Chains A and B, each alone.
Chain A
Amino acid sequence: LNKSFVKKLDESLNRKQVGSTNVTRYKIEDSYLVLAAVRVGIGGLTYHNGAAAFLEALKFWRYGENIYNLFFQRGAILNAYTTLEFTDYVFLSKEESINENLNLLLTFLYHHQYDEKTISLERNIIINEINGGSAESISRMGRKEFELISQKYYTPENTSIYVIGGNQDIDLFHIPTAVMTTQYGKPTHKVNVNEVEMNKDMILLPVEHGDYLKNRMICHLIADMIKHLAQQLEYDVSVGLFISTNQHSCYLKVKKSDQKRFSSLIQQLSMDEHFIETYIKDYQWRFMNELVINFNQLHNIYDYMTEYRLGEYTVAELFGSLDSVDKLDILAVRNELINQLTV
């Protein structure tokens, strides 16, 4: 809305290549901590169900050393987690420790040797974690598979780095691990959404109408509209979202048991002519307000960088995309949703 605020945010936001990876930087003056996030794309591993999570556990180990313990002794808590397309390694610390903590983290992530006893130990842990074919698939993979997968996916080229808060720049001199490359380039963005993400009792509905950013806008808009209409009719419809950084399209998750009710609500959207227009206006106002509020928490800024690729895109482009969503975009996606629901 107000141009000087969008301009204010964008002058703190930047993204540049560092070595063979990329660093997205959002500087915050006088922030109390700095958030660093290292994100590895593992979408291709979804055909080996559970391999990405297994790798995540292996990556905490290097020459008998555990990087969670090393970080803990330095007063930093390292958190990691694996979604369908990425494995994240995230930590908070004071800015003075960012360079050394980040380079130590990349030292572990770009280590590619794991002996037999380490692999079998992490497998045993994951099997007990299953009880507390995901368990089956990692039982069919050995040392040579995990080491090859590490060399193919845990590379600078397949890594995104995000550093939020503070005011120092990340450069190659301080992070020489950002050139620790292998003979393998960035892998294809293929993904086994069809098995891991959905099971046979759900359906995926594509929200894809051209624009990467607008797909997120329209997907949230339609999910919010359907939830509100379900509230008024007191439906029981659960609408999940599949919104992933490496996916150009966005997707809605609806139980196969709720398909008829969901289909009725999608058709209900165009019943009131002014409902779509005024709901778009409300969403645009709520989106900007929430961004203003959310840009005070480091983790929330990180979520904008992963969902909307903020850094590659500017905040001005984010709001320009938001302001370009119209009634015709909603109707076009409504029509395509109905065609998918029909067949």
Chain B
Amino acid sequence: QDPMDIKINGIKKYTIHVLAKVSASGMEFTQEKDFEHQLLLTDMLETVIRKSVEVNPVLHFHLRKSIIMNHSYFILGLNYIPPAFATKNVKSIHEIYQAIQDVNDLQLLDEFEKSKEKLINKIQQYKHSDSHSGSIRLKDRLFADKKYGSDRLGNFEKMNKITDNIIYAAPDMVNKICEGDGLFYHINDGAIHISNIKDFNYYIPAVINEGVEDIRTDFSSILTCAYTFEHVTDLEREILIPMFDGYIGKYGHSVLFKTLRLVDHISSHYDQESNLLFITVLCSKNQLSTILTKIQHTIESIEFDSVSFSLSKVMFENESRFRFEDINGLLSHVIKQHGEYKNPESFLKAIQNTDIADFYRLKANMRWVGTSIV
């Protein structure tokens, strides 16, 4: 029996029920030395188990090794038709465990090459993403560890040289997925159920190489700037800074679009994992030095106002509402958020209660740390 039944009321009523287990790991993912191996076996396992479990009433089976605030978690999920609308009842968690333990080693070997190619492709696409490439380079140098940037989806060299004797580590993974302690989440009938209260403590890497310039030479240009924030609170990392990023980055006439239209393809993003705000824009080399100084001066002398701040609050609430619309966005939210933020109503209420004085605290704690150009 679960120690608790934390029922969060007032949830959108979905056509399906969800049953998910989240298994913790006190090691920051750089400490894991078999990281690339654990990824590959997890995908192999998910593919095989899916073929056995994704039958009526189960519509989708999910099994991933995911990173949440620089800690790795095994996340198992089950989407299914509720029994009132189903011609067959859903398997219990015990029976789901039994299907995972009944996975055949030959079934896993048949997926080894296909799963290895799938993960190899995800690493290359991630590292080669043109707009996303700049930010990867900064995190490698800002944190003096390429696991935070280039190797976040696995080191390519380690992943590429894995042979099929990884099959002998499958029992260890099956045991960790089935027997590792975790929290259970259950979405049904307009409510979310959590089996216990445990706010897994986040980890954010501290900056070491402050002030980074990354010169590059290659013809047909890109620029990426990074800032960090000091004394980041949960309210800031989850609400205020995302609002601030939208304020200056994408909410219509953002500060940067208006500022750079004077010169006359702008993007910005706050990475909650690394506590970094990135700003990337395509430009010409003749516009490079000007736009760099122009972007820097704009951020330095940034000001706010309550009318436009009220609009950012409305916009960011609606963006959160759109994520809650998706049963997977809701589940992901309730998994990741701490304490009362787990309730979407409380999270939305917390957005409505922010004031402009919070942005001025955030501006004082803001500081440039990096730059990359191609």
Asked if A29 contacts B15 (CB within 8 A), the reply is no
Asked if A72 contacts B252 (CB within 8 A), the reply is yes
Q: How large is the interface on B (under 10, 10 to 19, 20 to 34, 35 or more residues)?
A: 20 to 34
Q: Report A31-43 CB contacts with B as 1/0, cut-off 8 Å.
A: 1110000000000
Asked if B12 contacts A32 (CB within 8 A), the reply is yes
Asked if A33 contacts B14 (CB within 8 A), the reply is no
Q: Report A275-310 CB contacts with B as 1/0, cut-off 8 Å.
A: 000000000010001001101111000000000000
Given A30-B12, A32-B325: A75 and B85 interface contact (C-beta under 8 Å):
no
A296 interface neighbour in B314, B326, B344, Cβ under 8 Å: B326
Asked if B318 contacts A30 (CB within 8 A), the reply is no
Instruction: Provide the residues of chain B in CB contact with A72, threshold 8 Å.
Output: 252
In the assembly, what is the distance between CA of A4 and CA of B84, in Å?
Answer: 8
Distance in angstroms from B253 CB to nearest chain A CB is 9
Distance in angstroms from B18 CB to nearest chain A CB is 11
Q: Does B11 interact with chain A (Cβ within 8 Å)?
A: yes
Instruction: Provide the residues of chain A in CB contact with B86, threshold 8 Å.
Output: 2
Asked if A2 contacts B318 (CB within 8 A), the reply is no
Instruction: Provide the residues of chain A in CB contact with B53, threshold 8 Å.
Output: none
Distance in angstroms from B250 CB to nearest chain A CB is 11
Q: Does A256 interact with chain B (Cβ within 8 Å)?
A: no
In the assembly, what is the distance between CA of A33 and CA of B348, in Å?
Answer: 13
Asked if A94 contacts B16 (CB within 8 A), the reply is no
Q: Does B10 interact with chain A (Cβ within 8 Å)?
A: yes
Asked if B321 contacts A94 (CB within 8 A), the reply is yes
Distance in angstroms from A95 CB to nearest chain B CB is 11
Q: Does A235 interact with chain B (Cβ within 8 Å)?
A: no
User: Which A residues have a C-beta under 8 Å from some C-beta of B?
Assistant: 1-2, 4-5, 8, 28-33, 72-73, 75-76, 92-94, 285, 289, 292-293, 295-298
Docked complex: B79-127 residues within 8 A CB-CB of A: 79, 81, 84-87
Distance in angstroms from B179 CB to nearest chain A CB is 31
Q: Does B229 interact with chain A (Cβ within 8 Å)?
A: no
Distance in angstroms from A279 CB to nearest chain B CB is 18
Instruction: List the B residue with the shortest CB-CB distance to A31.
Output: B12
Distance in angstroms from A113 CB to nearest chain B CB is 27
Asked if A75 contacts B314 (CB within 8 A), the reply is yes
In the assembly, what is the distance between CA of A51 and CA of B10, in Å?
Answer: 47
Given A2-B86, A4-B84, A94-B318: A33 and B13 interface contact (C-beta under 8 Å):
no
Instruction: Provide the residues of chain B in CB contact with A94, threshold 8 Å.
Output: 318, 321
* Leading 8 A-B pairs by shortest Cβ distance: A75-B314, A5-B85, A32-B321, A32-B324, A30-B12, A33-B321, A2-B85, A295-B15
Distance in angstroms from B99 CB to nearest chain A CB is 19
Instruction: List the B residue with the shortest CB-CB distance to A73.
Output: B311
Instruction: Provide the residues of chain B in CB contact with A293, threshold 8 Å.
Output: 15-16, 59-60, 79
Asked if B16 contacts A296 (CB within 8 A), the reply is yes
Q: Does B327 interact with chain A (Cβ within 8 Å)?
A: yes
Distance in angstroms from B284 CB to nearest chain A CB is 18
Instruction: List the B residue with the shortest CB-CB distance to A30.
Output: B12
Asked if A32 contacts B13 (CB within 8 A), the reply is no
In the assembly, what is the distance between CA of A293 and CA of B60, in Å?
Answer: 9
In the assembly, what is the distance between CA of A94 and CA of B322, in Å?
Answer: 10
Instruction: List the B residue with the shortest CB-CB distance to A72.
Output: B252
Q: Does B190 interact with chain A (Cβ within 8 Å)?
A: yes
In the assembly, what is the distance between CA of A296 and CA of B79, in Å?
Answer: 12
Instruction: Provide the residues of chain A in CB contact with B60, threshold 8 Å.
Output: 293
Q: Does B374 interact with chain A (Cβ within 8 Å)?
A: no
Given A5-B85, A8-B85, A30-B11: A92 and B16 interface contact (C-beta under 8 Å):
no
Supplied contacts A28-B12, A30-B13, 8 more A-B pairs, CB within 8 Å = A2-B85, A4-B84, A75-B311, A75-B314, A75-B317, A93-B318, A289-B59, A293-B15
Given A30-B12, A292-B15, A293-B16: A298 and B325 interface contact (C-beta under 8 Å):
yes
Q: Does B260 interact with chain A (Cβ within 8 Å)?
A: no
Asked if B318 contacts A75 (CB within 8 A), the reply is yes
Q: Does B315 interact with chain A (Cβ within 8 Å)?
A: yes
Given A33-B318, A75-B311, A94-B321: A296 and B15 interface contact (C-beta under 8 Å):
yes
Q: Report B1-20 CB contacts with A as 1/0, cut-off 8 Å.
A: 00000000011111110000
Distance in angstroms from A64 CB to nearest chain B CB is 18
Given A8-B85, A75-B311: A292 and B10 interface contact (C-beta under 8 Å):
no
Instruction: Provide the residues of chain B in CB contact with A75, threshold 8 Å.
Output: 311, 314-315, 317-318
Q: Report B27-45 CB contacts with A as 1/0, cut-off 8 Å.
A: 0000000000000000000
Instruction: List the B residue with the shortest CB-CB distance to A289.
Output: B59
A92 interface neighbour in B13, B190, B252, B322, Cβ under 8 Å: B322
Instruction: Provide the residues of chain A in CB contact with B81, threshold 8 Å.
Output: 2, 5, 292
- Offer 21 A-B interface pairs, CB within 8 angstroms, sorted by A: A2-B87, A5-B81, A8-B85, A28-B13, A29-B12, A30-B11, A31-B325, A32-B324, A33-B321, A33-B325, A73-B311, A75-B317, A76-B318, A285-B56, A292-B15, A293-B15, A293-B16, A293-B59, A296-B14, A296-B15, A297-B325
Instruction: List the A residue with the shortest CB-CB distance to B327.
Output: A296
Distance in angstroms from A224 CB to nearest chain B CB is 18
Given A2-B86, A8-B85, A73-B311: A29 and B190 interface contact (C-beta under 8 Å):
yes
Distance in angstroms from A175 CB to nearest chain B CB is 22
In the assembly, what is the distance between CA of A296 and CA of B15, in Å?
Answer: 6
